[PDB]
Amino acid sequence: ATPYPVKEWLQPKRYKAHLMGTTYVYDFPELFRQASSSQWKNFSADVKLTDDFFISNELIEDENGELTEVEREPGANAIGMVAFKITVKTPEYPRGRQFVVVANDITFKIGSFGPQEDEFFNKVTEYARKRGIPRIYLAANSGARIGMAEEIVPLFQVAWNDAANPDKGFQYLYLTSEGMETLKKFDKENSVLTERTVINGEERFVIKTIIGSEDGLGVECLRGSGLIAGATSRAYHDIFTITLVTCRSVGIGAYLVRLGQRAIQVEGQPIILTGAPAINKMLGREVYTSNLQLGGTQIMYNNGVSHLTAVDDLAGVEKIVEWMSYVPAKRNMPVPILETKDTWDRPVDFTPTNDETYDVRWMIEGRETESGFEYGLFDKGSFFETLSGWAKGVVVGRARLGGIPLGVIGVETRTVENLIPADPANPNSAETLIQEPGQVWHPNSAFKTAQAINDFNNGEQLPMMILANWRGFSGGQRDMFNEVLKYGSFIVDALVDYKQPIIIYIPPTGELRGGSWVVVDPTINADQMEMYADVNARAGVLEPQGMVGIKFRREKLLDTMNRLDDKYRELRSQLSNKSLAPEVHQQISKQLADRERELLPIYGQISLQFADLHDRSSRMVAKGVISKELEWTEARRFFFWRLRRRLNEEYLIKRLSHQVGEASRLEKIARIRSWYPASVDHEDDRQVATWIEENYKTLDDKLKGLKLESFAQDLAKKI
Amino acid sequence: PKRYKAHLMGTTYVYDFPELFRQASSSQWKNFSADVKLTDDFFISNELIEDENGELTEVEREPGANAIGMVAFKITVKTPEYPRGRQFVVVANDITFKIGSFGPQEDEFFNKVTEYARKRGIPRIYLAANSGARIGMAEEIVPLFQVAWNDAANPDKGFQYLYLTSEGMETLKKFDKENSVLTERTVINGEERFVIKTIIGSEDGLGVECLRGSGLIAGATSRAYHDIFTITLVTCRSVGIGAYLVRLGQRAIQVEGQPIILTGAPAINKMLGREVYTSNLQLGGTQIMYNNGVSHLTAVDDLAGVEKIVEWMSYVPAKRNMPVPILETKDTWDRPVDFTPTNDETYDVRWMIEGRETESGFEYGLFDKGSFFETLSGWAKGVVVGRARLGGIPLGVIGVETRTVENLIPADPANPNSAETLIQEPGQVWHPNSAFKTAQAINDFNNGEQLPMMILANWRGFSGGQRDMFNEVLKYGSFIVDALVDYKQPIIIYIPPTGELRGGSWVVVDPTINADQMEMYADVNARAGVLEPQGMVGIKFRREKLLDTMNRLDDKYRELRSQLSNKSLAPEVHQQISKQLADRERELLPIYGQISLQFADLHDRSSRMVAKGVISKELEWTEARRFFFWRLRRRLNEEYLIKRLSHQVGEASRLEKIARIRSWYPASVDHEDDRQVATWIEENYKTLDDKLKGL
């Protein structure tokens, strides 16, 4: 009979949790242990983990409401919101990093949000924020806590219109002196707001407002939803936030998942507002058959609300751990550099061809060809895609470049068949398929791009590379009506807001035209952006077919003919050098038309090539619009050292902006680069980075001392 | 001439706009105080131009000698809100200078102007009339290039590359343009052919350099919207960067038939090898941009367009961080609010806001008669966004349409199976568009306008259906929260009379979201609760509990209940009685369900809201105008004091600042009386001022 203690017996709560299809909240810490363990297996199997590599500390409020640490038997939570402070030693943080886990106890009042759960959830968020560590939220709730005064139930009355016929209706509810007394025989007068009265022989205290002695019935909870809605809203711009939906999320539940932005949905676990049964009655019909139709994975994932989906709670936890490996340990710390086995010093194997279609992910991480492995731009097996089920025109995810973490955005060259499911509420609604052309921003892909730039920026504080390859925005009616202009603008706002280095880069077979260029041009945020174009990329306000349709028309094509074709030329002269007889002019005009009707194609071809010669990177360098043109196969090596140099100098600027007399970026960049010895030329990225890194110790000193002179000069002289 | 050109375009000639502003300004007065006779210098417009150092400077010159396609004027006019005058610059595209194209210079000038406005904190108006980014080819290489055919005979069989002769090469050297093409010498039979590797041109503004400029200003306008009041009028057409410029400025009035697009119908039909679109208006006309919210407003023509810009400005400050422009008017603050909603029949939230004329007289609304200036009225009509004055105090106001919206949607021309679809949007419920409109308004009221705000909250919650959820309603609702967090002025949330605020709706407008600026108030005739009664009984007062209530308040039902449990009868007897138990339940159930509803409703009252301390006070509609006028005025005054304070060598926290201030008042002042506190502060701005510097 079970060789070991049945845990669902020792703690029935655990069984209720399992009965509702989710993990028992006090069992989630172990799930994070298991995932952190795998993190190491997948990175270095010969590593031997002790037991102190993972530490989970439960946090509960003390008397002054200050969260402290407590070790105690699970199932002892007085409120339905629990929290843990994890501090685990991971590959990118051998000495360990820390984060907090906030979770609804789904067994406690079905995970409902009451004033206490709310204030606790808020108290925890500020705990993380003040420390700068990530805030993980496991959501499994039933929303705001509802209720009625159960004390007024057993004793209210009905001022009927006609006592002997209740059907005729009533006029008001009230309590008898008896009831009015029954309340104090327990001290619950506040439970109601009455108004004295007498009648055909009796007392009548009409109820004007039922309030209830119990806390957590209505608006006070609503008040608490808002405290935490704005708290998360704020946290997202301050620390790495992320929510995992483990059973379901309703009301502020569905709003907290979104406000935290990054969200992982376990399949079968709905994210909803008002439930299907409620909607059905509302609509007076049996329209929906399951909450999944409202907030299931085919909605929230295809929608973009859920950045990822997981088959079960453990899978979802492993995805949170994986996501964190890219983020800094705490706010304002250098990005977690984890050198893999895929050295930076190598060529880039897979290369596109302006013919055969390709998956942009190949360029990103590589291809597993039937004859070996073609390495991509980034570290082998490092790409961690996100928002994969929404706006597939774009490809966003995290990655590592020579061990350096960064956000990556690519363009999907293949046409996406976005299939929209019919609306059950509309008897004559039809499943419909939208075809989204590759290399073109649509309302959804623009918004997605914006979302990604913002998520790399706010909590992750990451560098980012955009393999820009857009022919523009869709300008057709439908997409203009769907406000592609608004989502397109969001892109600019996101880049202006970005605080880490940005690399824009038109890849090989790529191009970046009119509308698309304006939203990614370095000038938008000169401080962090830089653009590069592959020697084999293209760029211009219009495409040749377009550029020609306006500045290389027929007449012009013909002028080129008369100048470059002997037959057409000599023919032109005969029609304009001598007065010919009608019969002869006709005879020759025909020979003209037929010649035009034979060279025209080739010549039209010639004009395109003329146009395409301006759309070259060489011109980009010439006009000073990019920083450099590059050799694709050499990109990895090049960017590896450009990012590392950029990052290294940025870290120095930030320090040189923590003291007193704030100076312009320029000056800080001056002061810094004068620290370099003649033996290292500024223009050399690998020369600078290596330098800064080899002297961090020394540098650290120079900066600290720089502050001392300040915080002691303004004082020494403050006479 | 120039004028004629511009008029062929359908727009007004650039140097004729100031005259239009002038005309509109004189109107403001005729509307304000008729009998006034402005003097020619009540308005002053100076054209701005670049100088040696490139630094903008004012000048007076020939209305038409601009060397670029971007023009700028510095308006300075005396208005009703600013008698001693207010300022603002106006940048525009010269539609006759290369079709308002954006060459690198038009760009760096525009950017230059924007920063000029941003540094002085003054509004930046933009008149859009352009063809987008400038395009061109190295025209000097067209008569000089050669084709190395596969076979000079039968040229139709291809070519290998373009080059320049030894001559053409000298043709460039001569006219000092040897830098128009990057080339590479070759050794064919006869002489050398410079193989064209890439063309550059001698003229500037042919491609990418143009795009750079486009970007530079895209981020410049993006930045300006968060720094100064920005607005733009679409006078002729706006293409590409022009259209992105209209959006990035956020505020936009669109002149009818003046399209805003990214690519013309021609290019697109061409793009789809078929005659899809007939007009550019189908792509960016007011039926497109106005209905979708990109164009807050539309004007019949340029003058009307400019008028609306001037009317919009009468609500915003003169320069960044300037006290909102108070403008007391005929309709004084001390009066009751007339129009009142009635759960019975339907109403228009506007009547509540601006009053309505009745076949008896003018029923005054909550705000100053005639001061409502609605915007974004062609998009998401579930919400009513606008600006008005409360006893002269300007402020953004958001109300809720209670009447169903019949959203009509045009078929898609490029999809031959498309059909005009009519989506009905129910009242008092957020949908993706209305939630989005709500956040946009809050964002626009806060960024350049810097206005206080009152939201007459009346929402059953968000749409939970599949469609509205599939369409991301969850994303736009959250936008609202972010907008409130960012708010920098005083906010007032007021659940109006026949109104309510439930589970999902209440969470995005709670005062705790931004304790520093918000406050909530509920009418004594309003409702609130996580669930609506129907929903509450649905869970907490079901069939069973209902029966338990019948068995307690209905004598015969208990009689019957008793018999079946206090004596043990014969089969036929137990059957008969059980039957009559049912007949009784199917008689009272209805009216008893009514009771459970009433029972639930008594929990959703403002009194409980006060009891719980979730609102500030319950109020009476008719008496709201009076209450709010002094609460706002009062808070405006304390905020003023909060800033003058904070601004010192020890900045503390709200609670603290607001407490060192309130500790300055006379001990006899009631920190709870708004009129008295405002009155005192105003009577002591200097006395208060002295004390400040006294630290």
Ligand SMILES: Nc1ncnc2[nH]cnc12
């Ligand atoms: N934007 C533009 N610039 C220059 N010439 C053009 N011809 C048509 N559109 C143009």
